[PDB]
């Protein structure tokens, strides 16, 4: 047995593939009220709703982001997007794929340099819905 | 197929009914006649076999009549005047009940029904009952009626015969009330007894009835077991409580034997799983009040330990831990502890002047 | 004697067993109010309820939490589960076993993964009650 | 002895809240006896703790 | 019986609006005042009330989609005349046991709002209203 | 004597209502108003009142769970006809020294609320009421 | 249909004054206050209302970035003479469905600000009207 290394890890956004692609994470975080019923000492809890959250991190290799919503952030209207993220370790048996839809990014970043480092890039984004590719 | 569009407006008057039946209480009548024979199930009076006797129609009638609800079903099986009973018990042996009666019997066919019972309890582990004439049996599952010359109408009914009253009032009673103190307004009159016998005859362990208050009632709700061990509990005397008891024990069934007999590999791991499982299912009893908080589940240690010390095993120097952890071929030994409430019976009140 | 070490863990949840499992805790903790009484300079407190609080570590051989959980919580249904721990420590002279019963998950990871790292995937959780088997 | 006969032998559970409304029963007989003057209004009724 | 995921929650509700189904709508309220007159008797210290009758009151609040409010009835107030609407909200948990829905009849409005905006703030709507009349269908 | 753990939690409360055990319930309160009046005597700076009378009041706070409050007077309410409950509170909590029970009678509620639902918000349902008496039940 | 994205944002709001566009705009707002009184019909216990007309209300907020408000009415209040002005507001989304933009007539503002100002706070003015009559152009 066998556990997936990153190092397989590849990204589609918005229908083109990205070549420069370091980590990528997505989760769904939950709401929660804390609800007390007569006669018992335990605390228990109501589900009310989720939240999805990610972030992306890249290498400065081209000026993707501004071609993707630079234009259109000022103009006031905001763009959506759709993100692929497959793993597929060859040790491991299978792969895995997940659709991640209606994605909306949190900030932008024009321009961040030091003298002797290479540029890196970090998006986080909110995301609604998922879907569910090659499920292992 | 697909067929014309239909449109089909229904009219039914389904309000005919009085003293609903209730879902529980399924009682077994054995009889011996002539014709009809086989097993004849009768849900109502409406449904009844035109070919049997006087005797066998009187004796159902009184089978049908319960305490506040009527029986559930009725499975009558009727054997030819010249049979053994044997016959008829490996046939009931497929078929699922509460109680079993037997109207017309002899001293002798009363001990094979005992022993028949007595073995389905133990050795199989099947928890039914049943309603006898005169029987001394010291078991729970036996319940042994002992008055004679019960005036129903102008016939001196015979002890045996009212033992089919007997069993349908039992199993009319429903889970929360007894059957402690309850008038037969159909019976008129009994023979004399006096108190203090009545009292040293029912402390025995027996099924009588008494003349007190207004009408006559049923003294006690007694059972046939009359000695107490110390695993043995002073509660298993009482009919209401053995009865919550069996239908907890058949109601387990649903989850023990369907699933994990024959499919599950025996490895202490899964007996943990099991006594959580069975846990988890207690506890939805006990949210709905059937029985009282705080029952626990889990390894029966002394069976388990007997078990050990039947084969070759040195049961010194061995920890508990160890004992628990040994596997036991392909058996189980589980033990649970739950309480149920009993009925008002006994009432002790002190006035200050 | 010896402390039982964690090597020798074991955990069930939802009746499979767990093959993978870095890690496992689950904590009770009380909830107090202060109260001051007078002619005492000591200040008193009431206990007033519980909260059941805990998290599992684990690999990402597979997408267990995913079928788990994920249908059903877009549908807007919470399931409950039930997990059992198990610790037995050769060198030490008994085992442990505790069940811990309505247990709700805090969130749910659908992917992360980084260049040259195994994938690791924590989940919270509350739960209301527990049951001890098998005490020391 | 005849109000308790009639209603409470082996009909209900012997739990606490049938206690209490057997209490209240006898409680209320008693309130009832108190407005022919047979006996004094301060009548109390409550679980022998002793026994 | 009880538990905490049988607790009713305000996402999974709905509200018809004259037949038409509202969509960007974020609460929704409705109750009856009765009213009741103090009443002294004779011998008895403690005061007692007698019911006399029951007003309705209620409010809706939207977010600002469209302009929907106005087309009802902004050129209908002008001339002198007053509509009155019919209101349907159903609450359909899945936790809960099934679903409760209510409708609220001869629904008058107490006002209406040409503009209100400020920078970088999202804009909302509400509506309170007054009713004199209630259906129960399939309550639980 | 007096000690911390004294002190009742209201997490041990329960409540019937109409004989059925309520218990989906947050919170009950229920209160006496004197009526005194101001009475002034000459040679005594001093003012002092005069006792006429008491008004009862209170209310009761549960979880939206179920369509209880409905089926008990809604239909009661249009008809012209005002129902009467009695209502019993039982504090037990282990620690106290035992528990307290109180019936209150005759109570007459004050308003019904047929819909109140919120996106994102668990629902919750508080009912005012009046009364007139009251017994007591196992005091301290 | 309903998304998050239609819903209409007030920064991109604009509000033209006697003709001219102000810039310096904080927030607009309009409303009308319906009259009805109550009336109790025998044999009901619903009581129901009559309307009887309407109110307008409104106000704005500005930056101080200028003396506008003083040019307009200083002179004439004093002398005794009222004017009355005509405002537009049109609330434009890129976003949302469209636009929609409001003629409010016959306004006739309530109080003049002479100065307002206090050390380490930034400068505003609001000034309340009231108005009679109201168009619809470009309704969503």
């Not at chain 1, 692929?84 to 340099?113: C, H, Q």
């Not at chain 2, 059972?223 to 005397?237: I, P, R, V, Y």
């Amino acid at each position: 047995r066998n556990v997936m290394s990153g190092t397989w890890g590849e990204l589609w956004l918005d229908g083109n593939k990205v070549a420069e692609v370091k980590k990528f994470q997505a989760k769904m975080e939950f709401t929660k009220e804390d609800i007390i019923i007569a006669g018992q000492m335990g605390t228990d809890t109501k589900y009310m709703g989720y939240k999805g959250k990610g972030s992306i991190t890249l290498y400065h290799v081209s000026s993707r982001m501004h071609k993707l919503i630079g234009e259109k952030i000022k103009r006031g209207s905001e763009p959506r997007f759709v993100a692929i993220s497959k793993l597929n370790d060859p040790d491991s048996y299978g792969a895995e794929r997940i659709a991640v839809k209606n994605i909306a990014f949190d900030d932008l970043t024009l321009a961040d340099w030091e003298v002797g480092v290479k540029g890196e890039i970090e998006a986080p984004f909110t995301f609604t819905e998922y879907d569910f590719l090659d499920i292992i | 197929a697909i067929g014309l569009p239909s449109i089909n407006i229904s009219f039914k008057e389904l309000a005919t009914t009085v003293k609903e039946r209730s879902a529980r209480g399924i009682i077994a009548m054995v009889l011996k006649d002539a014709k009809a024979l086989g097993l004849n199930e009768i849900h109502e009076k409406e449904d009844i076999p035109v070919d049997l006797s006087a005797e066998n129609k009187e004796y159902i009638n009184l089978a049908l009549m319960g305490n506040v609800n009527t029986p559930n079903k009725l499975l009558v099986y009727v054997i030819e005047g010249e049979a053994d009973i044997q016959t008829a018990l490996d046939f009931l042996e497929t078929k699922e009940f509460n109680y079993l009666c037997m109207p017309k019997a002899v001293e002798a066919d009363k001990t094979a029904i005992k022993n028949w019972i007595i073995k389905l309890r133990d050795i199989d582990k099947v928890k039914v009952k049943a309603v006898l004439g005169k029987v001394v049996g010291n078991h729970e599952g036996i319940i042994n009626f002992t008055t004679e010359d019960v005036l129903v109408g102008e016939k001196k009914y015979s002890v045996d015969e009212f033992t089919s009253r007997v069993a349908g009032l039992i199993a009319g009673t429903p889970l929360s009330q007894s059957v402690t103190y309850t008038k037969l307004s159909d019976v008129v009159d009994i023979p004399k007894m006096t108190k203090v016998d009545a009292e040293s005859r029912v402390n025995k362990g027996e099924l009588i009835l008494i003349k007190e208050a207004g009408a006559i009632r049923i003294a006690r709700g007694v059972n046939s077991l009359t000695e107490l061990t110390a695993e043995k509990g002073e509660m298993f005397q009482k009919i209401k409580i053995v009865d919550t008891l069996d239908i907890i024990h058949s109601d387990i069934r649903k989850v023990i034997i369907d699933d994990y007999i024959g499919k599950v590999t025996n490895s202490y791991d899964n007996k943990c799983l099991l006594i959580v499982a069975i846990k988890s299912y207690l506890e939805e009893l006990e949210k709905s009040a059937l029985i009282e908080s705080d029952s626990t589940v889990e390894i029966d240690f002394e069976a388990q330990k007997s078990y050990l010390k039947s084969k070759g095993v040195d049961l010194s120097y061995m920890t508990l831990q160890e004992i628990k952890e040994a596997n036991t071929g392909s058996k189980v030994f589980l033990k649970a502890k739950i309480k149920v409430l009993d009925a008002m019976e006994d009432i002790d009140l002190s006035i200050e002047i």
